[PDB]
């Protein structure tokens, strides 16, 4: 079959690499924009996240393979640098391609990349300082982290709720949040808003007037296999088949209901006294109006529709045990929630299980009237938290906003590699690949990239002042000053995926078809 | 170019690819055109004149090429032929062969100067062991078989069949008659073909052979005061009149009568200017001729510019139209001026032969000129293959035996030298087998058979090939030991001249 | 037809490379010859930048425009046109890269100049002041001829070069419009390059054996008619007056045998013997029988001279010019300690040689008489102007890129402005410098990178000027090597490179119309 040979085998690779990469430069930093990718769903995705648009819909390329490979882990490792991980290699390549365009080995030009990344990783290790887990210190990062991920006003509006999520951690060890992400979504009258709630919240509740609003002593009966059955941990069968069967089926349900609500109410009677202490059954299916009423007059707080994953964080928050039945139970299995509350904002009834015995979780209620809003404003949350958590997860952090960028480039002293130009050339595209971070930011504003960038060097060419593109104005700033800082996980890891994939290019000297 | 700009027909493909092939096809023609061969190449002139030759320049002169590649080099074979006889048919093919090794080196990606010099380097090395290849020298330029041994070669180097008596008759033409000490004359030695008899019947009349009719009575004296004239008699009459014949009638009878004694006047004034022979590039005039028969002035009814040339050349003559009583300027040179019949045609003969003014004019009998021409082609070379103007020519093996000698030598050195220089010097000693491949074809065998043995004969300066069955299986002839030898000289030239261009012709990408 | 701005600049810069690239060895011994059969449609051979330009009918304005300013250096140096084109387009390569990324075409053109200076300042800084001796000029001779021809060919050439200018250095004339007398001769080989401290006389006298070896040359360069003419000529000519023709027949040879006796007496006055050689040279025809009288007197009386030759005769000999030979003092005619009347081929080319106070020195070359014989004549002749610059400048620096890096270094080693703005220009500017060795080294050998990091680190380590082995690709101390840049040559083409590269960067449209 068809074999692509030599520079033809090289071209479409670097061609589909850099060009599609060049497609993406509307973004990466608050001076970047959102980028619209409509998936097969007809969904409107306006995103500044690089990790996102790769996998969703990307013009068919063999090169579309390795790009989806690396920037995945970039969102996986850090959560940021993903919008960053795009723009490095093309610069590196466009610069490196010259040497090959000048007839030098992708082999030897590989070897300067590898050699150069060290002293930048060194520089990263050098130019970083410990940027403490203090929320305000993380704010400046969370401020800036979401910026490279998304729009400032969106990067900003989350930064409040963002670090608070990573603030409630138990000394959790993750670079990212898991349980601090509890995504509640409401159709709102404000497109961008998020309600940050500590601990788990349940998707839907069940409200009843006799049902206690805020339960400070809450013995949590997690519930399943609902009132439609009679003391069964297994869900039984139904006959709706014939219009007559539907009639004779649903009447016995009351008794099936009656059993469980009974089993429920007397379970409150054991542990809680009669109504004396608050009580909560959480019925993770619907709550039948009798038992909805009958548990309510009981003093029980009966909760409709908690998720199986809500079930999962449920018994950890109250520190209790889940039950798949409504039925009399050892009191230990009833979880004690120092707070069970249920909050109805509009249509949705948000159960607040608070004073979570494990505050492994917090809850983010995502707002928007519109999908793309509700879609996107959720997106910024998800990457940024993962990113921003690195600011708390790593006491070390490292300056963002270009401050460090021109430095390693200045310090690289490409002639210092003297061996061939195996290194000495591959370091040249390297300092170039370094500065794409100030470029696009200096780019996206007025002037040029260089016009500001050439300041940034000549500015930091006065050494020790770590200067970079002021994130929005495309003009100089010192990123160490404001605290605009990219995660120790952002900047350290990023070079790794960058150096290897552009190398993978250079190691492919042939593509058969 | 990419632009609208400049001027080039070489470069890129052309330099590498197309010039080399422009450096190929004609060398490809010359391969069995040189050396012992049965190859024959038909040619038509601007005359549309059908003719066959294994000589190049004849073929060359009418060949036009948009490239200089084929174009420019042919001067070298001429620059060669300016120096000597054949070996010229070898000159270019030597280049073209060794050339296309470089386009391979260009495929192998060797730099020009890197490709260039190793040849040049070894071009010395050739010239360096080239004297080590002197297996003999030229003893008696008076001797026939001393000389005939050689002359057979360029003829052989032209064509295989007729070489022998040619090599004989050419020394029987007495290349002897000159010292060839630095004094040798191919104006005094001319090949003049009688159309008639045979070519084995072809003679050599020492003294100018003019097949042109000896007109009327022979020379007044044999040290001939010679009047060579482009138009000595154009007629003395003008008949323009009332009728341009008669109107006043007696006015006619004047000039047709008064014309002829003006031709007498001129002819008497040929006897009066003193010419012992008058020579007419224009026509003879009969009354004049009759007067020149009275005055016994030898005449030539009609004279080729070629005639007039050699006439004007050697006599010291000047061919002039004369409507006047003539003036000797031409005067004499030749101290015996005769009439011969060779092929039984009147041969105007001029001989002063001094060993220095010595005229030995080959007179070719034959029933075909194309015959006597492709003959004269090799005959052109043999005399000037004989013409080295070293009485001692340091005779080196004929036929190409010296080739394989240095094939081993210089590539063995080409081995020894290092670098990219190697194949430069290595391809060099590989340039030989081309003709040992070329004539091996017309011989009827592959060159490996040839060359493996031409290698396995190793250092000989004898064992070689050509058109022969000895050239077939044995890959052995005596291209020394049989009497086929070569002057040391043209070797140096056939070597050097082509090496220069092959180097040079590539370097120009324009 | 029109192309705007960006589209305007492409045709400019795009036209440069391939054009430019052909010259990538036009310089140093590695320089590759180029043959026009196409220039007028005629077979030729050339290496020079400006010359090859004009030679080819060159259709593109890009090709067209520099040849005009490339004429300047070839006027000045004669070479480095063999060079300058290379930095120019590589410079053109640099500026676009900005505008490619985007940048204003002004500021890049703007940023070349302090660059054009700080580098030119480096020229002041790098320029190696050398005290010119024939040897220094020998290696100056061969560095321009290596650019031209074989260093082999540079050899026999070098002699006459540094020797011809050697007698003009006497004249203390820093330039040579004399001792530029060159001669070509019938030969099988263009190898022969001959040096006549005097002249060489093209025309032979219609009479041979007059004085075939003129030892003492007493030269009256004479317009004189010693052929008035011998027969009926009236004013010297035919006419419509018999009455005048009837009077004008006799005085002819009388006016001639006058000038015969005017030479006869002159000869014996100049000589009194045939021992001391003697020469008469007519700008016109002479009677051979005049000559016959004179040829037997010990003169070589010559005719139909070329007024140009008369000068160098009148000058290098200190010769003289009259319309009447009269008699003149023996010394009253200019002199050449020997005259050698010389036939190669069929024509005697008389060497009036060691012409007393030569201002002119004649360089003969014998050759196949092809554009080969041309490719040698041009070759020496710009080196003549090159080596002439070494008379001009006391500063000659080596070539082979020994200059470039160290020059390209500083302005790159530091932003000379410490502006990105200028460095935009400068980095564009100071970069193109390296084109010459880096291709030549790679033309001859290994990738530029090594030699570059070599020559840089070398210069960085040395500061000694180290330059390519132009057939290897390895840097060698280029001063000692002898490949040498006149501080004249390099500085000019530097200016030449940049001074054009700006407003041509500034062509933001071109309409085809006029």
From Swiss-Prot, chain A:
Enzyme class, first EC level, given as a word: hydrolase
GO terms classed as biological process: chaperone mediated protein folding independent of cofactor; chaperone-mediated protein folding; positive regulation of establishment of protein localization to telomere; positive regulation of protein localization to Cajal body; positive regulation of telomerase RNA localization to Cajal body; positive regulation of telomere maintenance via telomerase; protein folding; protein stabilization
Any one GO MF annotation of this record: protein folding chaperone
Binding site residues for ADP: 29, 81-84, 148-149, 401, 486
Sequence position, cross-link Glycyl lysine isopeptide (Lys-Gly) (interchain with G-Cter in SUMO2): 241
Reaction(s) this enzyme catalyzes, per UniProt: ATP + H2O = ADP + phosphate + H(+)
Residues carrying Phosphoserine: 195
PROSITE patterns: TCP1_1, TCP1_2, TCP1_3
Family: Belongs to the TCP-1 chaperonin family.
Protein name per its UniProtKB record: T-complex protein 1 subunit zeta
Gene transcribed to yield this protein: CCT6A
UniProtKB/Swiss-Prot annotation, chain B:
Chain positions found as N6-acetyllysine: 305, 387, 453
Binding site for ATP: 87-89, 157-158, 399, 486, 491
Catalytic reaction annotation: ATP + H2O = ADP + phosphate + H(+)
Family, as annotated: Belongs to the TCP-1 chaperonin family.
Protein's name in the database: T-complex protein 1 subunit theta
Pfam family, one: Cpn60_TCP1
Complex formation: Component of the chaperonin-containing T-complex (TRiC), a hexadecamer composed of two identical back-to-back stacked rings enclosing a protein folding chamber. Each ring is made up of eight different subunits: TCP1/CCT1, CCT2, CCT3, CCT4, CCT5, CCT6A/CCT6, CCT7, CCT8. Interacts with PACRG. Interacts with DNAAF4. Interacts with synaptic plasticity regulator PANTS.
Compartments in which it is found: Cytoplasm; Cytoplasm, Cytoskeleton, Microtubule organizing center, Centrosome; Cytoplasm, Cytoskeleton, Cilium basal body
Main location: cytoplasm
Crosslinked positions (Glycyl lysine isopeptide (Lys-Gly) (interchain with G-Cter in SUMO2)): 211, 241, 247
Known EC number: 3.6.1.-
Signal peptide: none
Gene source species: Homo sapiens
InterPro entries xrefs: Chap_CCT_theta, Chaperone_TCP-1, Chaperonin_TCP-1_CS, Cpn60/GroEL/TCP-1, GroEL-like_apical_dom_sf, GROEL-like_equatorial_sf, TCP-1-like_intermed_sf
An example Gene Ontology molecular-function term: protein folding chaperone
GO biological process: binding of sperm to zona pellucida; chaperone mediated protein folding independent of cofactor; chaperone-mediated protein folding; positive regulation of protein localization to Cajal body; positive regulation of telomerase RNA localization to Cajal body; positive regulation of telomere maintenance via telomerase; protein folding; protein stabilization
GO cellular component, as recorded: azurophil granule lumen; cell body; centrosome; chaperonin-containing T-complex; cilium; cytoplasm; cytosol; extracellular exosome
Modified residues annotated as Phosphoserine in this record: 10, 149, 200, 256, 304
Curated annotation (Swiss-Prot), chain C:
Keywords per UniProt: Acetylation, ATP-binding, Chaperone, Cytoplasm, Hydrolase, Isopeptide bond, Nucleotide-binding, Phosphoprotein, Ubl conjugation
Glycyl lysine isopeptide (Lys-Gly) (interchain with G-Cter in SUMO2) cross-link site: 240
Binding residues annotated for ADP, in chain numbering: 28, 80-83, 147-148, 400, 485
Predominant localisation class: cytoplasm
Catalytic activity entry: ATP + H2O = ADP + phosphate + H(+)
CDD domains in UniProt: TCP1_zeta
Subcellular location: Cytoplasm
An annotated GO cellular component: cytoplasm
Primary role: Component of the chaperonin-containing T-complex (TRiC), a molecular chaperone complex that assists the folding of actin, tubulin and other proteins upon ATP hydrolysis. The TRiC complex mediates the folding of WRAP53/TCAB1, thereby regulating telomere maintenance.
Protein name: T-complex protein 1 subunit zeta
Species per Swiss-Prot/TrEMBL record: Homo sapiens (Human)
Taxon lineage: Eukaryota, Metazoa, Chordata, Craniata, Vertebrata
């Amino acid at each position: 079959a068809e074999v692509a040979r030599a520079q033809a085998a090289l071209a479409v690779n670097i061609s589909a690499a850099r060009g599609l990469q060049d497609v993406l430069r509307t973004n990466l930093g608050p001076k970047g924009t959102m980028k619209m990718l409509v998936s097969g769903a007809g969904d409107i995705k306006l995103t500044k996240d690089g990790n996102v648009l790769l996998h969703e819909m990307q013009i068919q390329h063999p090169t579309a393979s390795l790009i989806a490979k690396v920037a995945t882990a970039q969102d996986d490792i850090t959560g940021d640098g993903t919008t960053s991980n795009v723009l490095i290699i093309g610069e590196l390549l466009k610069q490196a391609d010259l040497y090959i365009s000048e007839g030098l080995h992708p082999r030897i030009i590989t070897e300067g990349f590898e050699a150069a990344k060290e002293k930048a990783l060194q520089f990263l290790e050098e130019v970083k300082v410990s940027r403490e887990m203090d929320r305000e210190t993380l704010i400046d990062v969370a401020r800036t982290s979401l910026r490279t991920k998304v729009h400032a006003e969106l990067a900003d509006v989350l930064t409040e709720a963002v670090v608070d999520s990573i603030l409630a951690i138990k000394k959790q060890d993750e670079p990212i949040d898991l349980f601090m992400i509890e995504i509640m979504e409401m159709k709102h009258k404000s497109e961008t808003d998020t309600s940050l709630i500590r601990g788990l919240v349940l998707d839907h509740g069940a409200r009843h007037p006799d049902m206690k609003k805020r339960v400070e002593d809450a013995y949590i009966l997690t519930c399943n296999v609902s009132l439609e059955y009679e003391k069964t941990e297994v869900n039984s069968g139904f006959f709706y088949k014939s219009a007559e069967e539907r009639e004779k089926l649903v009447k016995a349900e009351r008794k099936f209901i009656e059993d469980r609500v009974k089993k429920i109410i007397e379970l409150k009677r054991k542990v809680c006294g009669d109504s004396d202490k608050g009580f909560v059954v959480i019925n993770q299916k619907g709550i039948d109006p009798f038992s909805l009423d009958a548990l309510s007059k009981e003093g029980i707080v009966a909760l409709r529709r908690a998720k199986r994953r809500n079930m999962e964080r449920l018994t950890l928050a109250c520190g209790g045990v889940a039950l798949n039945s409504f039925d009399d139970l050892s009191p230990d299995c009833l979880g004690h929630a120092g707070l069970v509350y249920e909050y109805t904002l509009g249509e949705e009834k948000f159960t607040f299980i608070e004073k979570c015995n494990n505050p492994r979780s917090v809850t983010l209620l995502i707002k928007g009237p519109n999908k793309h809003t509700l879609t996107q404003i959720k997106d910024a949350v998800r990457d940024g938290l993962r990113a921003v958590k690195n600011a708390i997860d790593d006491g070390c952090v490292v300056p963002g906003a270009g401050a460090v960028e021109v430095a390693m480039a200045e310090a690289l002293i490409k002639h210092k590699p003297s061996v061939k130009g195996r290194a000495q050339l591959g370091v040249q595209a390297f300092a170039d690949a370094l500065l794409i971070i100030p470029k696009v930011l200096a780019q996206n504003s007025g002037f040029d990239l260089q016009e500001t960038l050439v300041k940034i060097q000549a500015e930091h060419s006065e050494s020790g002042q770590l200067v970079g593109v002021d994130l929005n104005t495309g003009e100089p700033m010192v990123a160490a000053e404001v605290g605009v800082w990219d995660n120790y996980c952002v900047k350290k890891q990023l070079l790794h995926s960058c150096t290897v994939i552009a190398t993978n290019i250079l190691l492919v000297d042939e593509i058969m078809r | 170019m990419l632009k609208e700009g400049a001027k080039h027909f070489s470069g890129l493909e052309e330099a590498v690819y197309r010039n080399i092939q422009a450096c190929k096809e004609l060398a490809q023609t010359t391969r069995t055109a040189y050396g012992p061969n049965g190859m024959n190449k038909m040619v038509i002139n601007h005359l549309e004149k059908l003719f066959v030759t294994n000589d190049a320049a004849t073929i060359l002169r009418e060949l036009e090429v948009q490239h200089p590649a084929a174009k420019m080099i042919v001067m070298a074979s001429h620059m060669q032929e300016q120096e000597v006889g054949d070996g010229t048919n070898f000159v270019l093919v030597f280049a073209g062969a060794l050339l296309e090794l470089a386009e391979e080196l260009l495929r192998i990606g060797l730099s020009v100067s890197e490709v260039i010099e190793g040849y040049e380097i070894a071009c010395r090395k050739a010239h360096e062991i080239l004297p080590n290849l002197v297996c003999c020298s030229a003893k008696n330029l008076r001797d026939i078989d001393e000389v005939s041994s050689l002359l057979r070669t360029s003829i052989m180097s032209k064509q295989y069949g007729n070489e022998v008596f040619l090599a004989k008759l050419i020394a029987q033409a007495c290349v002897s008659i000159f010292p060839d000490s630095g004094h040798f004359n191919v104006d005094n030695i001319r090949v003049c073909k009688i159309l008639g008899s045979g070519i084995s019947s072809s003679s050599v009349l020492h003294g100018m052979v003019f097949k042109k009719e000896t007109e009327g009575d022979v020379t007044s004296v044999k040290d001939a005061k010679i009047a060579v004239y482009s138009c000595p008699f154009d007629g003395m009459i003008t008949e323009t009149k009332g009728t341009v014949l008669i109107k006043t009638a007696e006015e006619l009878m004047n000039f047709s009568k008064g014309e002829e004694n003006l031709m007498d006047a001129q002819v008497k004034a040929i006897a009066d200017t003193g010419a012992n022979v008058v020579v007419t590039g224009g026509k003879v005039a009969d009354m004049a001729l009759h007067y020149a028969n009275k005055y016994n002035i030898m005449l030539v009814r009609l004279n080729s510019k070629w005639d007039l040339r050699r006439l004007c050349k050697t006599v010291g003559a000047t061919a002039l139209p004369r409507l006047t009583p003539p003036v000797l300027e031409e005067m004499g040179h030749c101290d015996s001026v005769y009439l011969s019949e060779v092929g039984d045609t009147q041969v105007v003969v001029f001989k002063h032969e001094k060993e220095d003014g010595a005229i030995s004019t080959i007179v070719l009998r034959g029933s075909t000129d194309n015959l006597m021409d492709d003959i004269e082609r090799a005959v052109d070379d043999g005399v000037n293959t004989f013409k080295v103007l070293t009485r001692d020519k340091r005779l080196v093996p004929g036929g190409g035996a010296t080739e394989i000698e240095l094939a081993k030598q210089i590539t063995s050195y080409g081995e020894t030298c290092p670098g990219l220089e190697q194949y430069a010097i290595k391809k060099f000693a590989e340039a030989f087998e081309a003709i040992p491949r070329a004539l091996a074809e017309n011989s009827g065998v592959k060159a490996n058979e040839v060359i493996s043995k031409l290698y396995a004969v190793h250092q000989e300066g004898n064992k070689n090939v050509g058109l022969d069955i000895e050239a077939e299986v044995p890959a052995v002839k005596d291209m020394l030991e049989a009497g086929i030898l070569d002057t040391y000289l043209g070797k140096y030239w056939a070597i050097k001249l082509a090496t220069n261009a092959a180097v040079t012709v590539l370097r120009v990408d324009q």
